[PDB]
Structure 1
Amino acid sequence: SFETRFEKMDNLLRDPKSEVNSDCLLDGLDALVYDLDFPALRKNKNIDNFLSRYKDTINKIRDLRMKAEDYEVVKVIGRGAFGEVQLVRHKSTRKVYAMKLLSKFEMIKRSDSAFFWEERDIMAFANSPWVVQLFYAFQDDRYLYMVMEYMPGGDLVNLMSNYDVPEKWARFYTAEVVLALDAIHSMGFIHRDVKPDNMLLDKSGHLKLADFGTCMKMNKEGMVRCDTAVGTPDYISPEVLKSQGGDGYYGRECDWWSVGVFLYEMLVGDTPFYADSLVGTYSKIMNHKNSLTFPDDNDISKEAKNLICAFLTDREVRLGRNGVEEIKRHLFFKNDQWAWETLRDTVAPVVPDLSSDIDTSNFDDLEETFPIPKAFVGNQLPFVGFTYYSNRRY
């Protein structure tokens, strides 16, 4: 019909999950103008005339749309090779956020684009108290930006380094991780790299997962086919570690192995397969049946030992193969302080004591430009559609 065709097209321009909504379309033109504005390419009159025709408009678009200079950077709270995380304050609204920057230069050098899409989607559409929320996502010729709610309580690496974690605390954090991973699993994703580094704490001391650079969408059978290993040397499961491509098929039960590693780390003070070298840590994971031991210190309960061992086994007999309820029913979680359904409403073991909205006390104290192209290379093309601003879900 004539109206239908018009209405279907109109919904596409408005839909926050559409590849052709206003956000993606503005990204398309912004990328085209960046990728063409070079003296060598401007020798072509089609390119030159187009850029001149859109000059004034592109400057208005770039001024009106969300940009880095709208944010006042308070402190850098995270740093990696692919980018940095910074505590920012939006100059207009005066609102405090955490902003994750990802280097487009770094992503182009090495075939490592495409990882940020699931991190964008999980944070933008999870609508879960267990997942850090994405408020805005934007970009320029140099970086990808993700404006998120700030987690002032810091991460679990910081907590474990400042406290000898008692079992009652370890039960709380393990239980919240179990609920958090289950929310991710329900969305159809496998985390693949669950670690204390990506377990953040809010102003109340309750957990939220962040850093989803390894998340992969499950298939019909709830599986993932991956030829190359993904994760961290200490927390990687044997099945993800040995994945060759010819036989590299695995499910959500790989995230349950990581919980086992996390619980062990909290109660013992070290990872179970730790070695003086990375290659030795690999050897110990592969030989988990003989390398998993507990120190001769009665501090770890029978139930905590049982859970660690129930998780730190081959995927075919691992606790969680039959679902979350078999994990939830484990005697380790038996207590009189909380219940699974009301856990995030209870008072957390460590309630952060914060001086202001820009307090960074739980965070440790802390550019290569693209060469001028001679021909069209389209370095901005793999980032088209990243913007989450003009068409958001409310």
Structure 2
Amino acid sequence: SFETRFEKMDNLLRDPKSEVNSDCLLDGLDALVYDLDFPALRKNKNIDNFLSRYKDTINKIRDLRMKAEDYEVVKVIGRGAFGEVQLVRHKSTRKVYAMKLLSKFEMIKRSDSAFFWEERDIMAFANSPWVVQLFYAFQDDRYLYMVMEYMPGGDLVNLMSNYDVPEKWARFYTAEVVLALDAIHSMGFIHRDVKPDNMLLDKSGHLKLADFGTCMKMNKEGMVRCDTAVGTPDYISPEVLKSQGGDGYYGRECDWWSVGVFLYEMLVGDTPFYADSLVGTYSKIMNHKNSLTFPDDNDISKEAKNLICAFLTDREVRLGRNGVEEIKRHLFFKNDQWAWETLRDTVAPVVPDLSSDIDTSNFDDLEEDKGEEETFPIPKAFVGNQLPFVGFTYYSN
């Protein structure tokens, strides 16, 4: 077991999970230069001499390290209002990735400076077939960049658009979602916003989760709360809605609610709590006992109905509170086509036909930004606008 203090420090430098690993240490030096280098501050001798020594070296480094210009944008596949996701090709390696941008200016402006750490940890270290991998995370003074495996199948929102979905497809996406969720729960995170938008497909037609921006680390009892605004409460559980009003905390069972909702939308074509307005949808969720109706549209399966209803109940009696297993054993999941262990080796309901490695078919065209980039007021003293982003850099090796 024993290691010397020198050995231990060496491990800190080399460990991708360490915040003092070499790449993170360059980040600091970089940021510090960014934030110090200004005529006003250069009047300080310590600062002026320091920037003279290191700057020539800092230019070598900024030249050497990965950068936005190592990639060319093929297209824009999504917009998050903190930035865009865009299809890219690496110039030297020819390889094709999806790339998320985050505006540093926007983040300082609105706060929301701390929120991307969990997404980073998850996509970097999950090492799951159920989770989109981040290959590189790097940055400059303007932006964060997350370079991710591209998922040409598109999301489940697109799928529900182009296909009516039989219980046989539903069961399958549902099961994969169960697994990705469980994977994420086992790393100690609660996803907390689980939607068809966050479910994408690889060239095989298999599902991965993306967009972990809402994810929070659970503690001991496996609970959390965050202050975070949520676009639509369509898939959001009642106890999460209550929590936003200060009331209290909650556990991973909130994610199983979303899945209950996801199923209903796949079979029935509609969100169960759908209303013309946010307020209406909101009331309906809080009303869920009396507000949840199975369709005009059909009789659909006794078993499907029962799973959906088991997920869409109140949290204390809700399916999945006793763990993933009682979910897996639900009779809704019985079939001849796949078993839980073999699921990803099955052939998928929809296997994308793709013209090229650049095929955008399953995504909507994203027109343009072409907006003029906002800049900060020149510091009269040190404001450290780069500090929140220090240690973000990651290279998978």
Instruction: Identify the TM-score tier after normalising by the shorter chain.
Output: over 0.9
Ranges in structure 1 where 5+ consecutive residues have no aligned partner = none
- The alpha-carbon deviation at position 371 of structure 1 amounts to 2.4
Contact 1:23 1:385 in 2 (8 A): yes
- The alpha-carbon deviation at position 230 of structure 1 amounts to 5.0
Contact 1:81 1:106 in 2 (8 A): no
Ranges in structure 2 where 5+ consecutive residues have no aligned partner = 367-372
1:73-118 deviations in Å (ceiling 9; x for gaps): 1001011211110110010111101111111111111221111111
Query: Would the alpha carbon gap of residues 334 and 3 (structure 1) be closer, same or farther in structure 2, given more than 3 Å must change?
Result: closer
In the alignment, what sits opposite 2:382?
Answer: 376
1:145-195 deviations in Å (ceiling 9; x for gaps): 111110010001111111111111111100000011000011111100010
Query: Would the alpha carbon gap of residues 2 and 195 (structure 1) be closer, same or farther in structure 2, given more than 3 Å must change?
Result: closer
Please state if 1:67 is matched with 2:105: no
Query: Would the alpha carbon gap of residues 117 and 287 (structure 1) be closer, same or farther in structure 2, given more than 3 Å must change?
Result: same
1:283-335 deviations in Å (ceiling 9; x for gaps): 10000001111221225211111111111111011111111111111111111
Q: Secondary structure at the match of 1:360?
A: coil
Q: Secondary structure at the match of 1:146?
A: strand
Output the CA distance in 2 between the equivalents of 1:183 and 1:38.
47
- The alpha-carbon deviation at position 369 of structure 1 amounts to 2.2
Output the CA distance in 2 between the equivalents of 1:260 and 1:155.
18
Q: Please tell me the root mean square deviation across aligned C-alpha atoms, in Å.
A: 1.8
- The alpha-carbon deviation at position 128 of structure 1 amounts to 0.5
In the alignment, what sits opposite 1:146?
Answer: 146
Output the CA distance in 2 between the equivalents of 1:35 and 1:390.
28
- The alpha-carbon deviation at position 135 of structure 1 amounts to 0.7
- The alpha-carbon deviation at position 45 of structure 1 amounts to 2.0
Q: 4+ residue stretches of structure 1 with deviation over 6 A?
A: none
Which moves more between the two structures, 346-355 or 293-302?
A: 293-302
Output the CA distance in 1 between the equivalents of 2:87 and 2:108.
26
Output the CA distance in 2 between the equivalents of 1:176 and 1:256.
13
Contact 1:77 1:365 in 2 (8 A): yes
Query: Would the alpha carbon gap of residues 140 and 73 (structure 1) be closer, same or farther in structure 2, given more than 3 Å must change?
Result: same
Aligned length: 391
- Per the normalisation by structure 1, the TM-score is 0.96
Output the CA distance in 1 between the equivalents of 2:299 and 2:109.
48
- The alpha-carbon deviation at position 5 of structure 1 amounts to 2.2
Contact 2:136 2:396 in 1 (8 A): no
Q: Secondary structure at the match of 2:309?
A: helix
Query: Would the alpha carbon gap of residues 97 and 276 (structure 1) be closer, same or farther in structure 2, given more than 3 Å must change?
Result: same
1:42-70 deviations in Å (ceiling 9; x for gaps): 22222222112112100000011000000
Output the CA distance in 2 between the equivalents of 1:210 and 1:222.
22
Output the CA distance in 2 between the equivalents of 1:117 and 1:27.
15
Output the CA distance in 2 between the equivalents of 1:389 and 1:347.
32
Output the CA distance in 2 between the equivalents of 1:347 and 1:165.
16
Query: Would the alpha carbon gap of residues 2 and 364 (structure 1) be closer, same or farther in structure 2, given more than 3 Å must change?
Result: closer
Output the CA distance in 1 between the equivalents of 2:10 and 2:232.
44
Contact 2:135 2:396 in 1 (8 A): no
Contact 1:311 1:318 in 2 (8 A): yes
Output the CA distance in 1 between the equivalents of 2:26 and 2:58.
10
Contact 1:226 1:248 in 2 (8 A): no
Contact 1:23 1:390 in 2 (8 A): no
Output the CA distance in 1 between the equivalents of 2:97 and 2:299.
40
Which moves more between the two structures, 299-308 or 55-64?
A: 299-308
- The alpha-carbon deviation at position 8 of structure 1 amounts to 1.7
- Per the normalisation by structure 2, the TM-score is 0.95
Q: Secondary structure at the match of 1:76?
A: coil
